[PDB]
């Protein structure tokens, strides 16, 4: 996408980055004025306003300013002060468009003559860069190749035949320095007129330029935050730059151009060729002034990117009211790989967020869309119409594409019945094998679904290349049979192990497709390369075209879906899912072979040919870039030289002289087959100002490149050209019935294709099958916008200031516990955190840590010691004291009961701390429980048991194991969150086992991390500490 | 029992499950210590054929942020005195969201770069001490101690629901045994 | 019922090659369990079937069993046998 930059930006880019041994003069000598500028800011930032004479230029991408009376030559600062008074902020007219003057550029005047003025122009073509020169400014042509350098020896012989001898060396130092500046910053156009080179040096008086805006990832540092001004007649809007910010942050395309904010016809059309066709049809029926915007989205945007694109569009049309009302066209052709379900779910979400002001403006919405998962995309688009009250009319594949334009403008009625309903000739064959570059498993499965339905013997995909993983095998389907396709880290491993592969389908991104395509041209087996990425710079694409011309390799792309040859081979995602393959009967060859620019119209051309003709022989989308790898003529000629092709359908866009070649291909007699062509983009001439479309190559540099003039040229050469795109269907039909009458087309016998089983997830989503869920969970939901802990979102978990004990109640009990119950749980985890290395579990962690094991294994080896004799006294004492308290007996009888059973009371008895020397962990937790808990009946029972057992020995006190056991039970049945059978269940299933384990896991990890820091070696137990009592010989 | 059931799932934690906290902390600190700009770090890891650990979410991309990331990033900016590794990782995140919107800092990569930022910028640790704790696996223990809470909750859930013994279905298993070898 | 008569396809998330049990006989890497015992391979014979999926020769099978007897135990003082004894003495 070549975007024009201002004179100020290009001159600033020249002064910072040119490498000329001749001294460039008047560097940084520019002043920008606005209708909201201060003259004190000019005189303080730039001190040269009074020192020299001055000239003034309107910097709003205006050419021929010196002939329209907008240039003041040789005026003083005081002279240019009153010069801007009737002009800065007033109207103007350059051709047809009209606009204001918010920008003028003030530069010092140069005393020059007509013999001092030169003219340099460097512009890019497909074959290289043309460098121009004219001696009388106010010509010569040199072609520098794609991978060739413009050396200073070459300017003198060719570009300097009429230059004076005393000025040759200073221009050849400048022109060679200008072309390296042209190449480094990725300029596509660079015109300087006039170029005044006096004896003092080189003066750049004017500079009109266009840079390749897709090369922003290469030249981000050197450009800075470059701004692209709109053409004259249209202003810039902040919501236009919001969509342009979303475009540059992904491989998907998101374009928006606001033609008229007061227009009643708003478009949200999917596809950069579909939106052109919708804009042609709206402008065809007299809606040019009411066409509010041109905008497209393609490249499979996400639900969030489509929501951000839709909610920008919805916010633009709800700012001013219209008496007749406003129309939102949500259109598009049948998609190939764009998920219509995720696309429309973003649009439905945006409409529900904006249902208020769309009732105010009487917005009527017409929807026509097909593609992958389009049934529930159109389903939820029909639901949002009735629950919000917005009149939304939904149509699909069966409806014609631009039918809804006539329904919206009031030209055709509403069909209320069908809603909810060295290049080679043979590139592909039935033995064609491909290597797919990247993880596109759905795209590869679409190819293998195509092959089995086309009754192929072998799958198209032989290998896949993904550089970010090791060599493995990916499981796919050969119909109902599971096969494995090998994945390779390196391309050289894939090409060596698969010598039969002749096609590469390159699914690399825009910043990685250049290096992948030049690497695969080092293998002579690959004859066809398909480049899917859109956004590759035009300078890098020309190097792909140049090396493919040397190696004799066909390139389909860039910015294509690929192509389809029914019965033999399809490229990637072309033709959509298998629902669209069988609907369009793309499993058997027909008679039409078509070529097209966009991949969105190729799936529409699949539908148009299928309903009017016996089928498609071979479809190719060449891509929407400025320089495609293979053009229209490279394929229309392969189609002529193919016996299976009977008629050809060509679909082009505005821009380029490629569709002219067909006329000079037909007039010479090379093409003898009936050709039905149509060039889209007839509304750009009928617009006010120049509009650059979603395609990079959809720019009309000349009046010859316009789609109206190209359609007139093909009409003169005997090509069947309809009046518009909606009349393409019966012109293709009327040619087809003409060749059946002549008998050169005979329709074949229809054979039913081999059907495949339906996908499980696709059958489960729309409810034909039921499959039992083998798992049931209640503690955490993660398949949503937010992580949910037992019905509570993760932001509300942190907002309400619950801690680790708060989320422990959510994960383990699924309850909102009170803040004392949460804080008691955390205090239980700190007192059970560690108890030294001498205990049995901490011993086992240290041995496993000293044996060189990881954190997980060392934790585990000691954590598995926890059980009955180590760490079970919390759960044992809780079960012991609750059983005595529930089966209500006095504490004196409980002590006597357990004595006669020969069992010690669990949770009673310390080794050293007895009485008047209490356990401090017990005294911390007992003080908390008495102050904060509302009622502690089991604690008061256990303290009376403790009073009895300290009458026997002073040591027999409540442990920290028995305190936690009787107070955790007291926390469960006396906090209000739990019933009695619920609190008894959690003790029964082992919640207090988990309290010790989660607490003691902290100290065991700390014991692991301690032994790694101390760097302790492998432990062997001493032999003198082991008593060997082995048998004699048994 | 609780101990065996915790353990059988806790031992899955390692490199592919639960290792992205420790992997991203080692990954971003190595780039920041051997001082290179975040643009060069993204280009360095692309040519080595390795994805950046702690970068990239499945569903939450941009203008729909991860809420666990937004809770912890707001805490770290307000309370930490200096976060040089977080600011490095956020500039790496600015570059990777220019490629796909999904390539944001995970909750694995946020915790990894902010735990390192907590160690060397709280005053308790020296630089060789803070680098040792990351080297011996302190962030492995942070995931393991955290995820042990939910695994015990997953154990206690299945005991309450009284779920029977699980056998995997035979139709979900692809038997590719040899012929007679 | 829909999977049996072939209207849907659902991808198998697991792949195995060492044992087939969904038949009339248990199969160890293509070899039935009766032929395992008929041909007098031992524990080292079924180790070659389960771990390598191969018919190993009788010296290779018998060498595997001899490796398991010499690595069977090396006293209680080693680090692993220490940890087993601690966990056994803790009532596990
Ligand atoms: C070509 C296409 C399919 C693949 O691109 P994508 O899905 O956007 O991106 P990828 O999966 O290649 O990854 C994008 C980048 O993210 C990087 N990335 C992914 N995960 C990462 C991680 N965890 N850490 C760091 N980087 C990561 C990848 O390395 C890749 O880097 P690179 O672009 O510098 O090589 C996509 O661009 C597309 O859909 N294009 C539109 C198709 C089209 O133009 N058709 C038009 C005619 S119909
Ligand atoms: C006789 C003697 C050696 C043993 O008594 P002791 O050590 O005090 O107590 P014991 O170890 O028997 O245990 C005391 C009680 O605590 C109980 N007990 C111990 N652990 C317990 C636990 N975890 N839970 C509940 N009860 C427990 C025991 O069951 C015992 O109960 P009982 O007395 O009702 O049977 C001791 O009394 C003593 O030293 N006497 C002095 C010797 C003497 O008199 N000599 C004088 C002349 S030189
Ligand atoms: N820096 C300058 N110094 C002196 N004269 C200038 C300067 N810039 C432009 N002019 C005058 O403006 C006239 C036309 O300006 P320009 O914008 O270069 O071409 P046009 O407006 O015809 O496209 C020329 O005749 C030239 O004399
Ligand atoms: O969304 C759509 O219908 C078109 C598209 O997304 C991409 C596309 O073709 O854009 P283009 O027409 O500019 O080449 C697809 O899925 O093929």
PDB file of C-alpha atoms in Angstrom, chain A residues 270 297 300-303 306-307 338-348 369 381:
ATOM      1  CA  UNK A 270     -16.143  -8.529   4.959  1.00  0.00           C
ATOM      2  CA  UNK A 297     -12.342  -6.305   7.291  1.00  0.00           C
ATOM      3  CA  UNK A 300      -9.929 -13.680   9.464  1.00  0.00           C
ATOM      4  CA  UNK A 301     -10.082 -11.107  12.287  1.00  0.00           C
ATOM      5  CA  UNK A 302     -10.833 -12.273  15.801  1.00  0.00           C
ATOM      6  CA  UNK A 303     -14.055 -11.679  17.719  1.00  0.00           C
ATOM      7  CA  UNK A 306     -14.364  -7.412  14.815  1.00  0.00           C
ATOM      8  CA  UNK A 307     -16.023  -6.004  17.951  1.00  0.00           C
ATOM      9  CA  UNK A 338     -12.761 -16.203   8.076  1.00  0.00           C
ATOM     10  CA  UNK A 339     -14.854 -17.676  10.887  1.00  0.00           C
ATOM     11  CA  UNK A 340     -18.301 -16.149  10.366  1.00  0.00           C
ATOM     12  CA  UNK A 341     -19.432 -17.303  13.827  1.00  0.00           C
ATOM     13  CA  UNK A 342     -16.633 -15.482  15.668  1.00  0.00           C
ATOM     14  CA  UNK A 343     -16.949 -12.507  13.305  1.00  0.00           C
ATOM     15  CA  UNK A 344     -20.674 -12.006  13.874  1.00  0.00           C
ATOM     16  CA  UNK A 345     -20.421 -12.678  17.621  1.00  0.00           C
ATOM     17  CA  UNK A 346     -18.237  -9.579  17.837  1.00  0.00           C
ATOM     18  CA  UNK A 347     -20.771  -7.634  15.763  1.00  0.00           C
ATOM     19  CA  UNK A 348     -23.737  -8.897  17.828  1.00  0.00           C
ATOM     20  CA  UNK A 369     -22.823 -13.558   4.469  1.00  0.00           C
ATOM     21  CA  UNK A 381     -27.538 -12.041  14.009  1.00  0.00           C
TER      22      UNK A 381
END
